[PDB]
C-alpha cells in the first residue's frame, strides 16, 4: 500500500553527504548515497545510520557503487561529474574542458535511471548545471516536468540572506528572485525584492538600506561561488547546495506545491526554446508543475538573452 | 547560568489550550495555564504533560489560578475575557507589573487595540513589551485565500492586513507577493481576477465572524493560538521576524497614543522597529477611520 | 511516450478523521502543523468544516502547505491512508459497522486507528465491518496508558519522558495491566532508582493505580468531556509511524489469533507499526500473577 | 530581557561543520566556529546560505580569534597525547577568560584524557565539563534495531567506559521500548553470538568509518550527540545520556574522567547514575580507567 520514499544520490561528495544527513534526520525517505568510489558513500551512510540512532530517525541510508541500488527512486538528485584537472596547472585548462566530459557522464546517469528509476524526479547539481540538465533530459527521456535543474534557490536565498543580513531581520520574510543561467551571467534581481511582501524600496526611503548596497548585494550574488571557493581554499560551497536540493525533493515528495527558482526547459518562455533557464516556478507531485514566466523589462530582458547565448 | 523559558497563559480556554499544546511539542519552554477556573488549566497541563511522554518532549506545563506562579515568565498571553473586560485588563497587568516585570506581553483579548492598550498602562513596561495578536492571524487568513486559490504553498504566499482587529481592518491585497513575485502577475496571466482579489479582502475582514457561524458554540482558536505562539517565539529566539501586529504608535502614520496594526519586527527586545508602510490617499483614509473607530 | 504521462508519481499522504470533536481537531491540527499529509475532518454537522478553515488559517502562519477539509459525506474519504475513528456499546457497536462498510467502500486500503470506546470491542466491530486484514485494524490505547505510567514516572525521577519507555496492555479500560516494576529509563531498570532513593515501590505501585484511573481523573479535572490533546498525539504518532513506514514500537489493541493463550479477542500489547500497519506482535513474558490480571481483562471485553 | 544561546565550537573541522549545519537548521542559538585557519567564514557564510533556504533566524560566523567566544553559553572542542593536551591547555585558558559560564562539551581523542585537560585549564566546576558516550552507545542501538529492523527511537543502550578500545558495550542490557532484548533472542529475530559481535563491532565501528572514508573519520554522528547534548543543556531538558564524568568516588574510582549515564540540564552534569554491574563488567571498568 504505502512505501517509503526513496532518494538516490548520484554522487557522495560533499554536497551528497549533507544531502543524506538532512533528508536522515527529517525522515524524508530512505537514502542511497551512489558513489564510483562504494567506500565513500557506505561511510557516509553508516555514519549517518549512527546519527539516526542519536537523533531517533527511522529511515535507511545506503552506500553503494552500482545502479542497480537506486531501482524505483522517487527522487535522484546528481552531483556526480568532473570538478577539477588535478595533472594540468591553474592557466592550462578554462571550465569549458570539462564539459564535454561531463556531457557524456550525464548520459551514463541518465540510462541508468530510465532503466532502473523510470519514475524518478530528477534534481541535477552538477554544472553547468543548464547545460548538464539538458544532458540529463535527452538520456532520461523523460518528461519535461520531471528533469529539473536546482540553482536560482541558492542564488536567490544567497541575494536574500545579503538584503537580511543588513537589514537585521529573519531571511524567512525576504523573497526574491535570481534568474538566468546559474554563472556569472545570472540576473539578481535585487531591486524587487520583498520584505514579507514589503517592497525593498521602502527601506531604501527609510534609511535602513541604500541603493549601494544593494547593486553590491547583486554582485556579491554573482560571485558568491568563487568567494567560497577562495574562502575554503580546497573545494567550493556545499551546505547550502544540498539543503537547497534537499528542499526542492521535499516539495516534489509532499506536493507542497513551493515556488522555487529553478532551471527549467523552455519552449516559449521569455522568448526561449529547447534550453534550460532559470526561472520561477512551482514544484509539486508532477515535479515542474508550472512556470511562472516573470514580466522583464527591456534591460532585464537583454541580460536574459545573453546568458542563453553563451549555454 | 541557563534557564527555561517560562510562558505564561493568562487564560486556559480553547485558545489557550492549543497554546501550551504547540509550545510543549516545540520545546518552545514551560507552560503556565493560569485561569480563573484553576481545574481548567489543570485538566490541560496534565493533559498536555500526557502528550510530551507520547511525543518525547521534555518541558512541563502546569495549570494554576494562582499569580504567584506566574513570577519570572518570559512570555504573557491573554485570552481571558469593552467597559469591564478593559477593567479585567487591569487587574492581569498589575499582577503582570509585580510578578513578571520582564515578560512579552502579547494581548488577544477582543477588542485588540484597546484591551492591549489597558495592559499598557496597568504593567506600566515599556510600548515595546506589549504587543496586540492581530495581522498575522488577519494576514494569514488573506495570504491562504490567494495560495488556495492560486494552489500555492501558502510559505510563500506574503501580504499585510493593516488597521485595527475588527470590521476596519485594512486587508492589502493589491500588494500581495508570491516568492517576491506582484499578485498582479498572476492576474496577467489569468491565475486569479480583481473581483476575486477584491472578494478575498471583504472575506478577510468577516474570517472571523464567518467561524463564529460555522462551529455554532465559540470562535476560531487554532490559528490566534499558532499566531500567538509564533509571536512568542520571535521573541524568545529573538528571530527577528517581521510580523503585522497590534502596536503603539507615538507619530507613525500621522497617529499617536493608539495602538495599531503594523508590520514589525519582533526580537528580544520585542518591538525592535516598526515598519511604517508607504501607503496612499485611498489607505490612509481607511486606516485613519480604523483609528476613529479605536 | 507511455512512460512519459502527466500522471504524477507520488501523493499526498491522506488521513481521514470519522468524527470531527474535540481529538478530531487536535489530530487535524498536529498532522497539518508535522506536514503529514492532507486531512479530512468528516462529522455528522459545519464542525468539520470550522476545524479545517480555522486549521488552513494556522498553515498559512506557519508555512504548512498541506490541506484540510470539512465534510458529512463518505465521498470525501475515498482512497484515504488511514481512517482515525472517535465518532460514537449496543449503539455504538452498530455506529462502528456503518463507519466500517463506508471504510470498505471507500477506502479498501486504509490504515484503521480506532479511539471509541470499549476500544477492544469497537475496533473488533470495526474488522468485521471492513473486511480488512487484521494488521491494518488497530485501537490506540496502550501508547496513551503507557505514555501517562511513564510521565508519572519522568515526573517523580524529575528526567525527560523521551527516555522513559514502560508498557500498559490488556484492555483500555479499568482492566489494563501498567507493568511499572518493569519500566526502563534509557535502558536503565527502575529498580535502580528504587535503590538510589529517587523513588519508593509504593510510589510505582501507586503510578500503576494512577495510570488506569487517568481517565477519570481529567474528566473531572475537565469537568465536561473527556481528554484529547494526548489521545490525538497517540493517533497522529501511529498514523505516522504507517505512512512513514517508521518500525516504531508501540502498544497498541491488536487482535489476537493465539498470543496469550487467546483468540479472537483485541487486547493491547506491544507491537511494530510500518507501510503494513502491525507488522508484528511482540508477545510479553508474562508472571503468573500477570497473566491472571490478562485474562481477567479479556472475560471483560 | 532575553537572548540568542551562543555555542561556540573550537574547532571548524568536519565536526564542527555539521554542528554548525545543525544548529542554524535547529535554529537553537547563534553559532560561532573557531579555528587555527577562512576555515570557519567558509562554513559560516556557506551556512548562512543555508538559513535562508530553510527560512531559519539565527547566525554564523567565523574567526581565529578566541575574543569572538565571549559570553559563549556552549563550548565544544574537536581541534588537535602530551602535544594535544598543550592545547586543551590553550583553548581552556581561554574559555576561562571569555566564557567563564560556558558549558564545555569535549571531543578530542583521548576524550577522558582531554576533557581532564580542560576541566585543569577553565577550572570550572565538576558539572560544567562534559565530553561526548552518546556516540558508542547510539552505535550499538543502530546495530541491534538494524538487525531488528525497528525504529532506533525505542531501542536504549549504554556504552560506558572510556572512549576507545576499553570501552563496556552492555548488549545483553539493551531495551527495545522497555522490552529486555532476551525476549527478541527468545523470538528469533537475533542471537547472543550475534550481540556478543555487535558489541565488538561496536568497539572498533570508529576504525571501521576510518577505513571506509579512507581519508579522516567519522563526523555526521559524532557531531549529532554533542548538538543534542548541547541542546539538553540549553534547554534544560534532563535527558539521560552516556558521557565521559569526572568521577569522586562512583564505580570505586576519582580524579579521572569515565564514560556513564547522567543528567543533563540547565546546570550541565546534574546527576551521574552509577549502574549496577556485575564482576566481569567491573574488571572491563577497571581496564579501562587504567588505560586512560
Not at 562504494?38 to 545506503?62: F, Q, S, V
Not at 515528495?253 to 523552455?266: A, F, T
Not at 518562455?269 to 534550460?276: A, K, L, M, P
Amino acid at each position: 500500500a504505502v512505501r517509503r520514499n526513496k532518494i538516490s544520490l548520484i554522487g557522495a561528495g560533499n554536497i551528497g553527504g549533507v544531502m543524506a544527513y538532512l533528508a536522515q534526520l527529517k525522515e524524508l525517505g530512505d537514502v542511497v548515497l551512489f558513489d564510483i568510489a562504494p567506500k565513500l558513500g557506505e561511510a557516509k551512510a553508516l555514519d549517518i545510520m549512527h546519527a539516526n540512532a542519536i537523533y531517533d530517525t527511522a529511515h535507511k541510508a545506503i552506500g553503494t557503487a552500482n545502479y542497480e541500488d537506486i531501482a524505483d527512486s522517487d527522487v535522484c538528485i546528481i552531483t556526480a561529474g568532473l570538478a577539477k584537472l588535478p595533472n594540468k596547472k591553474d592557466e592550462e585548462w578554462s571550465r569549458d574542458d570539462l564539459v564535454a566530459p561531463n556531457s557524456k557522464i550525464m548520459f551514463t546517469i541518465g540510462d541508468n535511471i530510465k532503466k532502473y528509476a523510470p519514475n524518478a524526479f530528477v534534481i541535477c547539481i552538477t554544472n553547468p548545471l543548464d547545460v548538464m540538465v539538458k544532458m540529463l533530459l535527452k538520456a532520461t527521456g523523460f518528461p519535461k516536468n520531471k528533469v529539473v535543474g536546482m540553482g536560482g534557490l541558492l542564488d536567490s536565498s544567497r541575494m536574500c540572506h545579503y538584503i537580511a543580513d543588513k537589514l537585521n531581520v529573519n531571511p524567512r520574510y525576504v523573497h526574491g528572485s535570481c534568474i538566468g543561467g546559474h554563472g556569472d551571467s545570472m540576473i539578481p534581481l535585487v531591486n524587487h525584492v520583498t520584505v514579507n511582501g514589503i517592497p525593498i524600496q521602502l527601506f531604501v526611503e527609510r534609511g535602513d538600506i541604500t541603493q549601494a548596497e544593494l547593486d553590491k548585494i547583486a554582485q556579491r550574488t554573482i560571485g558568491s561561488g568563487m568567494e567560497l571557493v577562495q574562502l575554503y581554499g580546497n573545494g567550493s560551497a556545499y551546505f547550502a547546495p544540498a539543503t537547497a536540493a534537499i528542499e526542492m525533493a521535499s516539495a516534489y515528495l509532499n506536493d507542497k506545491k513551493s515556488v522555487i527558482v529553478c532551471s527549467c526547459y523552455l519552449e516559449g518562455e521569455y522568448g526561449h526554446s529547447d534550453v534550460y533557464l532559470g526561472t520561477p516556478a512551482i514544484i509539486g507531485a508532477n515535479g515542474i508543475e508550472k512556470i511562472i514566466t516573470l514580466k522583464l523589462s527591456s534591460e532585464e530582458q537583454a541580460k536574459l538573452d545573453a546568458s542563453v547565448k553563451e549555454i
